[PDB]
Amino acid sequence: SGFRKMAFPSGKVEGCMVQVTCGTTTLNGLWLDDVVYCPRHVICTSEDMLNPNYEDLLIRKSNHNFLVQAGNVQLRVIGHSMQNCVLKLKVDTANPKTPKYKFVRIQPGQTFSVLACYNGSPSGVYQCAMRPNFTIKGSFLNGSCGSVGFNIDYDCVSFCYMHHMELPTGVHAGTDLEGNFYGPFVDRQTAQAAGTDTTITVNVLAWLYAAVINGDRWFLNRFTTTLNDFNLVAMKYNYEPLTQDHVDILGPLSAQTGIAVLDMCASLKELLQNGMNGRTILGSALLEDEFTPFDVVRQCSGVT
C-alpha cells in the first residue's frame, strides 16, 4: 500500500554524468559510448546570449577548447559537432558504464525522472511531467544545465530531456537528446514565456483510479457523462481535453477497479465542482496530475 511520487533508480544515469567546460562556463554533459552530449549554449559568452550565431561561435573552437572531466579523469575531445541545440563532443574513451539506452522524444503529460547535477556530480533525483505548455516544474539552480530526464522501463534507459534554461515564471525548458526543444523555446536570451498551463486530465483520472485501487471511494458518485460534456466542463477549469486515445489508455485501470472511464469522468466533474470538503485523496488536498496511467499500473498492486 501507499502511493508516492517515485523516481527510477538513478545509478545507470549517474555513471554517465560528466562536467564540460568551455571558457568560463561549466555545465553538465551526458557521456554515452564515446560521445558527450551537452547544451550548445556552453559555447556562449556574455555578449552572445541575445543573438548567438552558434555556427559562427563553434567554427572558432578546436577540440582542445572543450574540457571534459569524468570524476577526476580528463577525457580527450577528438571531435565535435552540433545537432540542433546540443553539442556532441567525441572523446577518446568510450564510457565503460554506458547502460543500454535510447533517445525518446516525449509528449505532454508523460512523466520522467530528473537527475539534477552540478559540475558533473549528481545532486538528487525527482519525478517530473512534461506540462501541456512544454515546460517542466523542476528544481534547478545555476550550473544544472545538461542535467537529464529519463525513464528506465526494463533495463533500458530512455533519455528524454536535457535541461537548458529557466523561464521567467520559474519553470524549466529543455530539449530531447537530439537537441530539439520541447515547445516553442529557443536557446536565446530573448523575451519568451510559457503558455498558460493546463491540468493533465488523463493523469488526474489515472490517479483517481489509483486511489480506488488503494481502497478509497468517497469521491465516486452515481452519475456518468458523455465524453463531450465532460470536455465542455473540464476546459472551464483549465483542464486539458480528454480524447478517445486517453479513454482507451485508461481501459485497463477501469477493468481492474470496475469503474467505467466516463463514470470516473463524472466523479472528476464533481470534485472540480465541490472541491474536497476537507478530505484528501492519496494524501493530497489537490488533484494530482503528474502520474500517468502507466505509472499508476507500475506502482499500484494488481488487486484493488
Add this chain to the structure above:
Amino acid sequence: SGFRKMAFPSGKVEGCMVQVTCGTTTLNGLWLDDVVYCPRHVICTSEDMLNPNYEDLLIRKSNHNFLVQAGNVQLRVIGHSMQNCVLKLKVDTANPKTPKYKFVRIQPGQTFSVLACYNGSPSGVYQCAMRPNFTIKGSFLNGSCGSVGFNIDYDCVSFCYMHHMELPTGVHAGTDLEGNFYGPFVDRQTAQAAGTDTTITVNVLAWLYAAVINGDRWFLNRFTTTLNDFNLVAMKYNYEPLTQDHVDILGPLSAQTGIAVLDMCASLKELLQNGMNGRTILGSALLEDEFTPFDVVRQCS
C-alpha cells in the same frame, strides 16, 4: 528555482541489493563487504508467523538453506547469525561495489531516501520522513521487505532503515541496520497499529522558508511571537513542540530571508488558526512537513 521532493542519487545503494530466499520466502538483502543483511523474518513459515521463536528457527537452518542471488549470480552463504531483528548472512565474496558507508539510527522528523526493491531488483526511489509515531508513509508492495533507506553526506552512504512490514493503516515499519525497530513494533503477526501521528513543526517552518526563497510570500505578516505562546498553539493543532534547538537549526534560513524563526512562527500560527483561504504554498494546499532544514538548504543553495 523550483522545489521538489528530492531523493539522493541511489546508484551507490543499487549496487548493494541482492535477492534472499529461504524456503518459499524471497525478499531483498543488502550486501556490504562479505555480509548480506536482511529481515530475520525471512526464516518463518506459515506456522511461524503468529509466534516465531527466531533463535530456535535459526538453529534448524544450515548455511545452504539461504539462496542469495546477486543479479544473475548465486552467492555462497558461509555463515549466518542474527543481530536484533536482522539476519546477517556471511558470504564467500565481498561486494566489489561496497560504497563507503555507516549504519546510523535516525530521529523522528529526519528524512531519508528509500530504494524500493523487489526480488533484489531496485524499482524506484522516493523520499520519506521518520514520523513522530515512528512509521513511514512509504509505497511498498508484497516482496519489498529488505528495501533500505539511506542518506548520503559526502561519498558516504548512511544506511538508516530496513523495511519489515506494513501496518493496517497502510503506513510502514522497519528497523535500523542493527535490527532495532523504529517504534513499538515486533516482527510477528500480532495486533499492531500506528499511533496517532503529529506534524513535524520544525520541518513545516523549513518548508515555509523554502517557499519564501522561491518567492511565495503571501503568508508573511508583521507579527512575531514567542516559543512559549507558539508551542501552546502547536499542541492545540497536534504539532510537535518547537524547541530552542529547532530555532537554532533554522538559524541559517532566518538570516538568508531576513525572517526570524519566531517571525515565521507567527505566519504558521495564522495559517493553523485561519487556514490558507484558497491559496497554495509551493503548489500545496496543505502544510508540508517532510523537508528538514538541511533538506531545504541543500536544495535551495
